[PDB]
Amino acid sequence: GDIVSEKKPATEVDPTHFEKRFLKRIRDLGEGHFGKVELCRYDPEGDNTGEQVAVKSLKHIADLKKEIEILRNLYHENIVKYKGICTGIKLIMEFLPSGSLKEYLPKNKNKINLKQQLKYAVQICKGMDYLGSRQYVHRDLAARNVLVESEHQVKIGDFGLTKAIETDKEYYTVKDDRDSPVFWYAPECLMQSKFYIASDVWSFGVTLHELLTYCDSDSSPMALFLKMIGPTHGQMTVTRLVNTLKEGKRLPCPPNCPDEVYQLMRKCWEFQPSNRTSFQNLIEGFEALLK
Numbered sequence: 001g002d003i004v005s006e007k008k009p010a011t012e013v014d015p016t017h018f019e020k021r022f023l024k025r026i027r028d029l030g031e032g033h034f035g036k037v038e039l040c041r042y043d044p045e046g047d048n049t050g051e052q053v054a055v056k057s058l059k060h061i062a063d064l065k066k067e068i069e070i071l072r073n074l075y076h077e078n079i080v081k082y083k084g085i086c087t088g089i090k091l092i093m094e095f096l097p098s099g100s101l102k103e104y105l106p107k108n109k110n111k112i113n114l115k116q117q118l119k120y121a122v123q124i125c126k127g128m129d130y131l132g133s134r135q136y137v138h139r140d141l142a143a144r145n146v147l148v149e150s151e152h153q154v155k156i157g158d159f160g161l162t163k164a165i166e167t168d169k170e171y172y173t174v175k176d177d178r179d180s181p182v183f184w185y186a187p188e189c190l191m192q193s194k195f196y197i198a199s200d201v202w203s204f205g206v207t208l209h210e211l212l213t214y215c216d217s218d219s220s221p222m223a224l225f226l227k228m229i230g231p232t233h234g235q236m237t238v239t240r241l242v243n244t245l246k247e248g249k250r251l252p253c254p255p256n257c258p259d260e261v262y263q264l265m266r267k268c269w270e271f272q273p274s275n276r277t278s279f280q281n282l283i284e285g286f287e288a289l290l291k
């Protein structure tokens with residue numbers, strides 16, 4: 001008889017599925033090593049009216065898929081929104097036009113006083129506490145990974161190194177560590193590549209320092225540390241860092257930072273993880289300073 005085709009089923013539209021043919025690149029937002037994030041417009045009508053989105057791709061497939069599964073199931077006002085995927089696979093996120101603290105703080109000093117800084121600090125802590133409650137370690141908390149939604153709101157905006165801590169275990173052991181942000185890392189991470197929730201508290205301390213210096217490049221943790229230890233030690237750098245930290249030396253108080261803010265910061269940097277403050281205690285500390 002007649003050619004037998006297949007009865008077409010009712011094709012619903014998934015709002016989390018972005019078609020590659022309509023995803024149009026505008027510019028690069030950031031990158032390094034294995035992955036990159038690009039600003040695109042998803043423009044299915046082809047008239048330049050479509051939504052702008054942040055697209056994370058690979059320059060490692062399984063890592064990105066894990067990252068996508070983590071972000072997709074995180075819901076918090078201080079965590080960047082998952083929008084969908086393009087399938088190889090690309091992670092589609094909301095685009096925050098003010099960028100990260102790295103871009104925004106140098107340009108908005110007149111706008112952002114100590115009060116607004118402590119409010120960001122509180123919001124970064126709330127996000128991180130949420131992540132910790134879901135049994136995750138972030139491993140990459142730095143100002144460049146903190147996005148500005150508005151003058152009054154920040155969100156944690158990249159989860160590429162985030163790992164799950166096994167239930168009834170205190171830490172995660174890392175193998176791939178070539179490209180570690182060592183000037184943000186707690187001693188136990190540098191020495192044994194173990195990562196506690198308290199190690200994120202340490203990194204938070206260093207992120208708070210960056211906030212307080214408005215992410216000035218000449219006051220960056222890397223810059224300040226390389227002054228403390230020496231900028232020309234090559235592969236001996238990390239060991240000299242570990243050594244300086246053992247001796248009890250820490251980043252200095254930022255200019256115009258009240259001692260009471262600086263002490264909250266120093267509690268992030270107790271050498272022993274069990275001696276460090278928690279995110280909830282940081283929150284309480286900042287809120288007491290705020291009112």
Ligand SMILES: Cc1nc2cnc3c(c2n1[C@@H]1CCC[C@@H](O)C1)CC=N3
Pocket residue numbers: 029030031037054080093094095096097098099100103144145146147157158
């Ligand atoms: C610099 C920057 N601007 C962003 C706007 N929206 C975003 C993201 C943005 N980023 C960085 C991209 C690379 C990783 C992070 O440093 C953030 C990321 C996600 N949405």
